[PDB]
Every structure is written in structure tokens, then in C-alpha cells.
Amino acid sequence: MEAIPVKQFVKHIGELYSNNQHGFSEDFEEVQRCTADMNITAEHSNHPENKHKNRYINILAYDHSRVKLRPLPGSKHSDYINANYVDGYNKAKAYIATQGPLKSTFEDFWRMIWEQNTGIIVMITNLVEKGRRKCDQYWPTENSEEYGNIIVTLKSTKIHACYTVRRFSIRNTKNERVVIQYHYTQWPDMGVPEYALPVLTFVRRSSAARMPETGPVLVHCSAGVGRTGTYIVIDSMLQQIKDKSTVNVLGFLKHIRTQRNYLVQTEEQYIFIHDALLEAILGK
């Protein structure tokens, strides 16, 4: 793939912005087409017994990359969750990208976290936004809550200006494990954040919390495609920057688009990614 040095990438952002952002539009349209003929299937997401398990009837999880739940005694689709493995920088399946859990999928959600040996949760949405319900609260407001066989206890809450951190312990009833949730709280109702700094701080800190060598970091928003994808791209590229001082947003994005539908859902989010990477490069 075609990694470009930071210096050239910075000049490249200037060009994508030029002529009324003509290059961003050109890129994003490439991204929107890039899997159109791959007949990538999602039969499990569509199967009727899994309909209530999907937050949006049209936001699916490709079969080849879906995160499978271990089967359970009694349904045959007990293995399904609207979630996908997504690659990060130099590490396959660095993330699980998933929708915001439904009350009906709370058990499946924690069992996935248990079964995947997940330690970090990234939540890039508020529960409600602009009157509209985006995600259901899958964690105890305080103390402990039980979701099937996993009991989740809230151990600490730190509120920051732009995001909150919550430390949970989870135990399987067949405290044993630590799961930390990074919950970005200052994302606007309509569109993308006006300043990338707060998001870059959120990305860097929630990324560093990833301890060796643990399960995939779970990233969700509402549908788990837009902001989720935006986070995954920014994180991976920061890491490529630290590592090689190169960047390749378009090629990485076209790649992960094979792993979940709609990752980085809008051109506005795609532009944002570049503004964010530019500020990071101009900083340190």
C-alpha cells in the first residue's frame, strides 16, 4: 500500500480542500463505491430471528468478519451480535466495531466482552441526542448490575470536560476482570466537532489504555459505523505516524470498509479525520 510521508500528506490535505473541497468529495465517493460489487454477505443479520438484535434494520454486520458468540443451549442464532472485527495499524482485529446495545442485546453484549477478553470500551455517543435515542444504558448507574451470567460492578467514575471514564469489574458466574469505558460526551447533535483537539486527547488516552496483550478494543457509537469508523481511522493513523511518519487514510479506509459497512459514514466525517490528523502533526 501507498504510505505517504507526513510532509507530503500535509500538502495533500491542502489539495483535497482546494477547489471547494473537490478532492474530499472525490475520495469519499471512491470509498462509497469500493465494495459495491463484492457481494459481501450478511445472512445472519438479515435472518428473521436476529431482527430485534439489530439497532438499524439497514446497518448490518458482514458474515466473514462478524464477531461470533459461542453457541447456547435451547436457540441456534444465540451466536449472533451486530459486531465486526476491524483491523487497526499493524494488527488484525485490533477493534470490534458494534452498534450501541439494545436492552434486548445487553447479555449478548457483555458475553462478547467476556468471550473476547475485551478490556477497553470506547463509546462515542450520548444515550440520547437531540431528543432522539441513540444507545441504551448497558452499565449500572451505580454499584452492580447483572446481565445474564456476567455481573457488572461500577468501581469508579471520572468526569472530564469532554468525556467520562468509568472503571468496571466483571465476573462470570459460569470481580475477576477490569473493563474500562471511555465515553466521549461532547459530540454535537448535528455534524462533527468544531475543534479536533478534544477528540485527539480522547483518542490518544483511550488508545494508550489498551494493555498488552489483551482482546480487541470495543468501539461503538449508535449504529457503530460513522463515529466508530472515524475513531478507528484516526487512532490507526496516529499510530502509523508515530511509527513510520507516514499516513494513508484512503487506503486504510477502503480496506476496513470490507470489514464493516459504512465505517466513516459521511464526507463530513472523512474531512474531519484529515483536520484532526493535521492538528496532531502540527503539534508534536
UniProtKB/Swiss-Prot annotation:
Substrate binds at residues 189, 221-227, 265. Changing residue 132 to E: Loss of dimerization. Found in a variety of tissues. It comes from the Eukaryota. It is found in: Membrane. Residues 24-280 form the Tyrosine-protein phosphatase domain. The active site is at 221 (phosphocysteine intermediate). Monomer; active form. Homodimer; inactive form. Interacts with CNTN3, CNTN4, CNTN5 and CNTN6. Belongs to the protein-tyrosine phosphatase family. Receptor class 5 subfamily. Possesses tyrosine phosphatase activity. This is Receptor-type tyrosine-protein phosphatase gamma. It comes from Homo sapiens (Human).
